[PDB]
Design a protein around this ligand. Structure first.
Ligand SMILES: *[C@@H]1O[C@H](CO)[C@@H](O[C@@H]2O[C@H](CO)[C@@H](O)[C@H](O)[C@H]2NC(C)=O)[C@H](O)[C@H]1NC(C)=O
Ligand SMILES: *[C@@H]1O[C@H](CO)[C@@H](O)[C@H](O)[C@H]1NC(C)=O
Ligand SMILES: *[C@@H]1O[C@H](CO)[C@@H](O)[C@H](O)[C@H]1NC(C)=O
Ligand SMILES: *[C@@H]1O[C@H](CO)[C@@H](O)[C@H](O)[C@H]1NC(C)=O
Ligand SMILES: *[C@@H]1O[C@H](CO)[C@@H](O)[C@H](O)[C@H]1NC(C)=O
Ligand SMILES: *[C@@H]1O[C@H](CO)[C@@H](O)[C@H](O)[C@H]1NC(C)=O
Ligand SMILES: *[C@@H]1O[C@H](CO)[C@@H](O)[C@H](O)[C@H]1NC(C)=O
Ligand SMILES: *[C@@H]1O[C@H](CO)[C@@H](O)[C@H](O)[C@H]1NC(C)=O
Ligand SMILES: *[C@@H]1O[C@H](CO)[C@@H](O)[C@H](O)[C@H]1NC(C)=O
Ligand SMILES: *[C@@H]1O[C@H](CO)[C@@H](O)[C@H](O)[C@H]1NC(C)=O
Ligand SMILES: *[C@@H]1O[C@H](CO)[C@@H](O)[C@H](O)[C@H]1NC(C)=O
Ligand SMILES: *[C@@H]1O[C@H](CO)[C@@H](O)[C@H](O)[C@H]1NC(C)=O
Ligand SMILES: *[C@@H]1O[C@H](CO)[C@@H](O)[C@H](O)[C@H]1NC(C)=O
Lengths: 50, 454, 420, 49, 50
């Protein structure tokens, strides 16, 4: 019964990675665990229809 | 093979039922020579331990030792662990001081216990706290040893649980309390659930100070482990009626069934190790005088008659039988709940109040509240299987669902609720700041009088 | 009106010194009618019948203090455990004097064990004093002995609770293997160079040989070991310029016996001034009743404060350890032990000798070198991360955009599809 | 972010039966007129528009 | 005004039942009405409470 991460966070916290260069969705949960930089992109959400 | 079962008991437990424990047991006998030696010892000194080990180890090379204890001495299990380290013989501890929890074993020792460690007990107690939404709590740790592992296990469990526990800082002790500096740390406490890890003679003074400081209220809870709760007969009057304890002392399973399961585990390990290697019986000849194939890391995979009796890396059981008890108003340790493989069972899912801990406690603040299942008002849904916790706007409740129409017996299934009236009741609890008792009705609809019966 | 003291001691000269200390203990304590008898037992190469002989002899003697004073034992087990367990059956304090294992620190296991020597984890606090001097934050832990490894991790987290920093790499494994150089190279790729080691002599010599073959003992590599790692073939395999610790009078038995006699004698003369006097019964035959003043005499031993001895201010904590311990800090200059520091109970002072390092200058090597090659990981974002297969062999077709901007690609490494 | 939203548990129970591996799978699925809506960032879908 | 309920003392405090009413205090301004002799004990109890 242990919490674990995966993906880019799982590869970063394991020491195999150094810096995630990706459009990281900034939230309150990941701010508690790692430190954040200044955002380069500023945008919102939308719905893809046809 | 040759297994000796020696028992040190004060109650009149005879020996011939152990002689009858050889015949019908192990019907599919894979070892060609299975023999048991049943012995009873009246004294509890380690001199008799060394003497009987030197007798039975030289007694035609007995490879199995089974011991149960009736006293309250935890050093006997440490002596048997030293004997298992010196003689390289798998030794099992059954009851009493032979089953009391020790911290760390050795690779040279093949001693094992049929019990429940403090880490799995803390897991069960935090499971109880998760199942009750008792998220605001505290922790008081004394100078009783084995305490920093307990604090670190609580810290890792809070860091690895979906609750996000609102934990007050740890009230630490240095000596017996002066009631000068410990008074400031005890007056920091304003939460309900209080956890404690100490001995019994310390707990008497702790509960005396808590009654002197008024920490035994109806809101305030007290959950203690099994090591502080000693004999069932010796209960001092300073204990609050409603004291939550968790101990694996099950009166439904006697010592004979436990040693039968231990013999089943021993014969299972011997039969599974004989299929891999040939020269399995290898012991020491005698004590006077100046190993590769061992069962130390072999019987982790074991299952006897469907009972999940598997062993851990530390040497304890994977799924033991924990028993959740409370203290009733009649000053008795009342058996309440039992524990499943990993999940927890609750015979009394309705949490009792025990609101009058003492005689002079005039308290009438709880309110019994019932509602009815309507879709735009009380959305009644299942508990989340990913978290096993109602989410922060939903509140838990119970529902007495019957099994059939044949019996009137049912189960109080706990579910989550949200909606309009749930928000109304939560805002009433915010404004008035009371305590509520929310549940569901199982009789039926709103109301109808049938011959002066609603 | 008698007090018996049991001892497991070998040499006749130190037995005579022990009896002389017992005789001189009643000198300054007046003409009071208390008597002091001493009973010392010798060796047998086994351990079961030794435990039998010592336990029934101390039951027949009814002693109050039990002492084991054998450093140079050929068996590397170092276990006075069964006599301490037999005394803990009646809650009688055994004063261990030689070993420093962390399994004796657990008072839940060793119910009535006291000692005047600390475990090696307190040396990490001395190494935390290094963090108070050399201002180093990121460390690399390597512990093979898992019986003390959890206690070392606990003490390390207790030390790091103040600064609220984190250890970069911790390691626990089974002692006896040899192919641990992969984790050594993984620690070498990290920014820090601080190496904390806690093992026996064999694993220390193994990792010394592993650092010597892979040249992990060059410039900036911080090495910081203790007394167990500078003995045997580990001292032969040690590189020059390594910093180690030394226990002052750690093996000097003659003054240590007199210090133990003074501690036990003042504890007995403190206990004689109070009421509720109980005696150990004849527990060999027909007596399982425990000695009722076990925790009471333990509480007497908790507040024991002393002012006599060549070592100095001996004092027990809540764990019964040693307070205010003089330590030495040694350096290995061209296969010669050179003293470079002294340590009181709170502060490190280097002596007039210089501190010559295995790397460059005599000042501290800042072994915190940031990664000049930052490992970049990303996800395949469709308008942002364009991934194109190579043309012939690991090459990128340098195509040009419509705005005169050449695309500066990079050789990345990626999987092909999902795992099923 | 929707799991923090304690008032949209219905969408959390609905979208769990149709979660895809990558966003390009969703682009290909709505390209075949099999999907109907997809919550995504702004400028990526602006570039794809 | 946001007024909390009146904490009424009874006798010289046992620091058992009065402490329950003192732990209910979550406000900022504490209004005390007593004599000079009991004020020392009340301020000492409040300092012990924090
Ligand atoms: C060894 O002992 C001496 C005397 O106890 C220590 O000197 C005092 O130590 C405390 C704590 O560091 C300081 O606050 C005092 O100012 C010191 N006293 C003096 C000299 O003013 C000393 O620190 C210890 N170690 C050494 C030699 O540095
Ligand atoms: C029981 O105690 C008696 C002494 O009263 C002793 O002779 C005997 O060996 C003990 N063991 C048994 C048989 O229980
Ligand atoms: C455990 O033992 C049984 C014995 O039949 C074996 O079949 C099984 O593969 C083993 N593995 C497990 C489930 O641990
Ligand atoms: C208990 O037993 C069942 C049947 O083996 C098993 O599937 C389950 O995982 C165990 N856990 C529970 C529900 O206690
Ligand atoms: C009672 O049990 C029978 C068994 O078939 C089942 O069909 C019936 O639905 C049950 N009644 C209820 C509603 O509990
Ligand atoms: C069982 O009781 C329920 C109560 O509503 C009833 O609806 C159902 O018909 C009963 N089943 C039978 C057939 O006994
Ligand atoms: C005092 O100690 C000596 C040496 O161990 C021992 O021979 C003697 O029995 C003890 N005193 C007594 C009881 O005469
Ligand atoms: C095996 O041990 C040797 C010791 O010199 C070492 O050089 C080698 O790297 C090890 N192999 C692995 C897999 O680490
Ligand atoms: C060993 O030392 C040589 C110089 O003598 C150096 O070139 C080499 O990099 C060292 N080995 C490693 C991998 O550290
Ligand atoms: C260290 O050893 C010597 C000889 O054993 C003795 O004087 C005493 O034990 C200690 N004192 C010193 C520093 O000489
Ligand atoms: C011994 O201890 C008991 C319990 O604390 C105490 O009542 C008694 O006064 C003590 N004995 C004497 C003579 O002081
Ligand atoms: C260390 O040794 C010095 C010199 O003997 C002494 O003054 C000091 O008190 C010792 N450290 C302690 C015990 O604090
Ligand atoms: C990688 O994927 C591509 C596209 O499906 C395929 O052409 C190629 O063969 C794959 N690589 C393998 C399986 O060698």
């Amino acid at each position: 019964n242990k919490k674990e991460w995966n993906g880019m966070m799982g590869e970063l916290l394991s020491g195999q990675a150094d810096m995630i260069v990706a459009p990281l969705t900034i939230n309150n949960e990941r701010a508690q665990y790692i430190e954040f930089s200044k955002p380069f992109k500023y945008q919102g959400l939308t719905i893809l229809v046809k | 093979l040759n297994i000796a079962v020696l028992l040190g008991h004060s109650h009149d437990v005879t020996e011939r039922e152990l002689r009858n424990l050889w015949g019908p047991e192990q019907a599919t006998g894979l070892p060609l020579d299975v023999n048991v030696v049943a012995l009873l010892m009246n004294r509890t000194d380690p001199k008799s331990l060394i003497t009987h080990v030197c007798d039975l180890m030289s007694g035609a090379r007995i490879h199995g030792l089974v011991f149960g204890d009736d006293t309250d001495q935890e050093a006997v299990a440490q002596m048997l662990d030293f004997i298992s380290s010196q003689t390289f013989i798998p030794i099992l501890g059954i009851h009493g001081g032979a089953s009391m929890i020790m911290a760390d074993k050795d690779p040279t020792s093949t001693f094992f216990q049929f019990g429940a460690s403090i880490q799995q007990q803390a897991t069960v107690m935090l499971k109880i706290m998760q199942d009750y939404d008792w998220h605001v709590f505290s922790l008081v740790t004394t100078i009783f040893p084995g305490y920093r592992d307990f604090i670190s296990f609580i810290k890792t469990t809070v860091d690895n649980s979906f609750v996000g526990w609102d934990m007050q800082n740890v009230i630490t002790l240095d000596t017996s309390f002066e009631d000068a500096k410990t008074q400031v740390q005890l007056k920091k406490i304003h939460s309900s659930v209080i956890l404690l890890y100490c001995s019994k003679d310390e707990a008497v003074l702790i509960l005396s100070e808590a009654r002197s400081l008024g920490l035994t209220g109806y809101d305030f809870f007290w959950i203690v482990p099994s090591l502080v709760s000693g004999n069932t007969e010796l209960i001092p009057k300073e204990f609050p009626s409603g004291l939550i304890s968790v101990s694996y002392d099950d009166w439904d399973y006697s010592l004979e069934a436990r040693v039968r399961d231990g013999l089943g585990i021993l014969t299972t390990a011997a039969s599974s190790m004989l299929e891999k290697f040939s020269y399995i019986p290898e012991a020491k000849a005698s004590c006077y005088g100046q190993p590769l194939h061992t069962l130390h890391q072999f019987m982790v995979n074991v299952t006897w008659d469907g009972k999940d009796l598997s062993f851990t890396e530390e040497g304890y059981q994977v799924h033991p039988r924990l028993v959740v008890i409370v203290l009733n108003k009649d000053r008795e340790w009342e058996k309440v709940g039992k524990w499943e493989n990993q999940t927890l069972s609750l015979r009394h899912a309705v949490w009792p109040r025990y609101k009058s801990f003492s005689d002079c406690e005039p308290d009438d603040n709880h309110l019994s509240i019932v509602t009815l299942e309507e879709a735009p008002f009380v959305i009644v849904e299942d508990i989340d299987p990913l978290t096993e916790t109602c989410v922060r706007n939903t509140v838990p409740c119970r529902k007495f669902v019957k099994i059939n129409n044949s019996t009137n017996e049912g189960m109080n299934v706990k579910k989550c609720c949200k909606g309009f009236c749930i928000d109304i009741l939560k805002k009433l609890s915010r404004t008035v700041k009371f305590t509520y008792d929310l549940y569901l009705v199982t009789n039926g609809k709103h109301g109808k009088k049938v011959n002066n019966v609603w | 009106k008698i007090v018996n003291i049991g001892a497991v001691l070998s040499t006749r000269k130190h037995e005579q010194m022990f009896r002389e200390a017992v005789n001189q203990a009643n000198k300054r304590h007046g003409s009071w009618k208390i008597q002091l008898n001493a009973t010392s037992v010798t060796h047998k190469p086994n351990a079961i019948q030794m435990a039998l002989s010592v336990c029934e002899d101390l039951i027949s003697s009814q002693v109050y203090a039990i002492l084991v004073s054998h450093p140079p034992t050929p068996n590397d087990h170092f276990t006075p455990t069964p006599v301490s367990y037999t005394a803990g059956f009646y809650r009688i304090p055994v004063l261990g004097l030689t070993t420093r294992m962390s399994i004796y620190s657990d008072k839940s296991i060793h119910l009535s064990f006291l000692r005047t020597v600390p475990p090696y984890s307190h040396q990490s606090s001395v190494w935390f004093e290094m963090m108070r001097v050399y201002n180093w934050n990121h460390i690399i832990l390597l512990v093979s002995d898992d019986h003390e490894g959890r206690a070392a991790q606990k003490r390390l987290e207790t030390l790091l609770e103040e600064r609220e920093s984190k250890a970069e790499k911790v390691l626990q494994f089974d002692p006896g293997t040899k192919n641990v150089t992969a984790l050594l190279m993984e620690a070498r790729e990290l920014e820090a160079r601080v190496i904390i080691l806690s093992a026996s002599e064999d694993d220390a010599a193994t990792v010394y040989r592993a650092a010597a073959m892979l040249n992990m003992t060059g410039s900036g590599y911080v090495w910081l070991v203790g007394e167990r790692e500078i003995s045997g073939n580990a001292l032969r395999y040690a590189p020059d310029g390594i910093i180690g610790l030394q226990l002052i009078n750690g093996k000097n038995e003659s003054a240590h016996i007199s210090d133990a006699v003074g501690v036990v004698a003042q504890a007995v003369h403190e206990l004689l001034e109070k009421e509720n006097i109980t005696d150990p019964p004849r527990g060999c035959v027909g007596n399982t009743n425990i000695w009722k003043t076990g925790p009471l005499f333990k509480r007497v031993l908790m507040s024991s404060k002393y002012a006599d001895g060549v070592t100095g201010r001996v004092e027990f904590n809540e764990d019964g350890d040693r307070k205010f311990a003089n330590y030495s800090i040694m350096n290995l200059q061209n296969r010669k032990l050179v003293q470079v520091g002294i340590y009181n109970g709170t502060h490190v002072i280097p002596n007039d000798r210089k501190i010559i390092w295995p790397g460059g200058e005599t000042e501290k090597p800042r072994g915190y070198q940031m990664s000049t090659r930052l490992k970049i990981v990303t996800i395949h974002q469709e308008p942002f991360v364009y991934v194109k297969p190579t043309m012939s062999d690991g090459t990128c077709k340098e195509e040009f955009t419509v705005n005169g901007d050449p695309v500066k690609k990079v050789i990345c490494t990626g999987p092909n599809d999902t795992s099923p | 972010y929707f799991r923090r939203q304690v008032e949209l548990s219905t969408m959390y129970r609905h979208m769990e039966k149709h979660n895809y591996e990558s966003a390009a799978e969703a682009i290909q699925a709505v390209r075949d007129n099999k999907l109907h809506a997809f919550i995504w960032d702004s400028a990526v879908l602006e570039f794809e528009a």
